[PDB]
Each structure stands twice: as structure tokens, then as C-alpha cells.
Amino acid sequence: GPMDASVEEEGVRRALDFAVGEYNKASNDMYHSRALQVVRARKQIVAGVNYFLDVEVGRTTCTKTQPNLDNCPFHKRKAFCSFQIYAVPWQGTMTLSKSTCQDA
Amino acid sequence: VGGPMDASVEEEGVRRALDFAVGEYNKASNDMYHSRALQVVRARKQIVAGVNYFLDVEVGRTTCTKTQPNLDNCPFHDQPHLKRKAFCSFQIYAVPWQGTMTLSKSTCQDA
């Protein structure tokens, strides 16, 4: 989650300049705009990994409601999948950003 | 550079990502047989590291134009018909050691 950030931080002030710039690009106005003042400043450290996994996937001889599926024997369907996964490894979180499969 | 670079299939993160993805696959599939990994053919990773900056800002109209040579010395308007101010919320994703920033979100309301 977000936490308090001090405007003393170089990165905070650099982000103000950026956003003010973006405002000027967006605005229909001949006049330049700049910040009167920051009224709130927060930061969130972002740290994760994207996994890009190209995999071939087969059909086992077990149903999905069965046990010990990790070493369940293989069979005829064989697919190619490209997965993209975002992980925050010390939070033990993972999220599927993209899954694209075809028969192979 | 954070990547995308080839990541060892021996790494625990790569293995977990695979178990997850294959789980998600199975979870969303309609067929009643369990499917699992036959061969990882390529495994890559990209380190995502940065800072999200959430700034609420009051933006003011200056007497300088956008095309002026120097924008160091730009007072705000004080004349009734010209004076403008907006209250804005920006979210900026920053990767400092890269010197990159992207405006992820922005909302400004006339104030």
C-alpha cells in the first residue's frame, strides 16, 4: 500500500515536474501552467518479476478431482501455451497477465 | 536493464510460475482431465522495480505562454478573467536509476 512521502525527496519533486509537463501537453491553452503547491504526496515501492513462460502442455490420464496429479502419467492432446505471470515473490503472490494457447 | 532475460528453469520462481500458470490454465479449462507441463521451451524474466508517486496538486495558470524561451520566471495570473486553478491527482510510475516516468493516472477538476 501507499505511504507518506516528503517533498524533500528528489524523486517526488521530479515527479511533480513531470506531471505538470503532462498537464501542459493535455491542456487546450496558450498559457503555461505550473504547480501552485503539492497538497498530498505519497509513494509506493513497486518490486516484482514478470515471468514469460513458453510451454507445451499435455493431457494426463488423471482427472482434475484426483490426487497426486504432478506425477500423473501422460497420454492425445498436446498444446502450446505462452504465459505471462506477475509475481511478488516475498508476498507469495502471482497473477496471470496473459495466457495464449493453441493446439500443437 | 531488468530484462526480459532468460531465467533458469531450475530456479524456484520459474518452477512456481509454471505451477501457477498451468493451474490457472486447468482452472479456466472445460475438459475434465488434468493437463500439465510437457516441456518448458523458453523461460524469461524481467525485474519490475520502481516507485509509484501519488501527488495531489493545485495547478495554476502563469502569464508565460507554452512557447516562451524561458519558463523560470512565470508568475500566476491575478486578473479576474484570466486566473485559473485546477485540483489534480496524478499517479506517476518512476524508475529513477533509469530516469524514466510514465503518467499512469491523472484526474484534474476545474477549481
Best to test chain B binding among A8, A9, A23, A53 (most B CBs inside 10 Å) = A53
Resolution value (Å, 1 decimal)? 2.2
CA of residue B8 relative to chain centroid, distance? 27
Task: Report the chain A residue with the minimal C-alpha distance to residue B53.
Answer: A43
Cβ distance of B34 and A96 shorter than 8 Å: no
Experimental technique of record: X-ray
How far A67 CA lies from chain B's nearest CA (Å)?
10
Cell of B104: 499512469
Sole residue written with cell 492432446? A77
Interface of A with B in 35-94 (CB under 8 A): 35-66, 69-70, 72, 74, 77-79, 81, 83, 85-87, 89, 94
Of B14, B35, B15, B5, give the one whose Cα is nearest residue A80: B35
For A78-93, give one letter per residue: b (16+ CB within 10 A) or e.
Answer: ebbbbbbbbbeeeeee
Nearest CA in chain B to A42: B54
Q: How many helices (H) and strands (E) does chain B have?
A: 1, 4
Residues 6+ apart with CB under 8 A from A95: A85, A86, A87
Distant-in-sequence, close-in-space partners of A15: CB < 8 Å, separation ≥ 6: B53, B55, B90, B92, B94, B101
Pick from A82, A98, A69, A93: nearest CA to B16: A93
Partner residues linked to B46 by β-bridges: A50
Domains of chain B: 1-111 (3.10.450.10)
Query: What three-state secondary structure class fits A52?
Result: strand
Cβ-nearest to B48 among A34, A49, A77: A49
CA dihedral in degrees (B24, B27, B32, B37; nearest 10)?
10
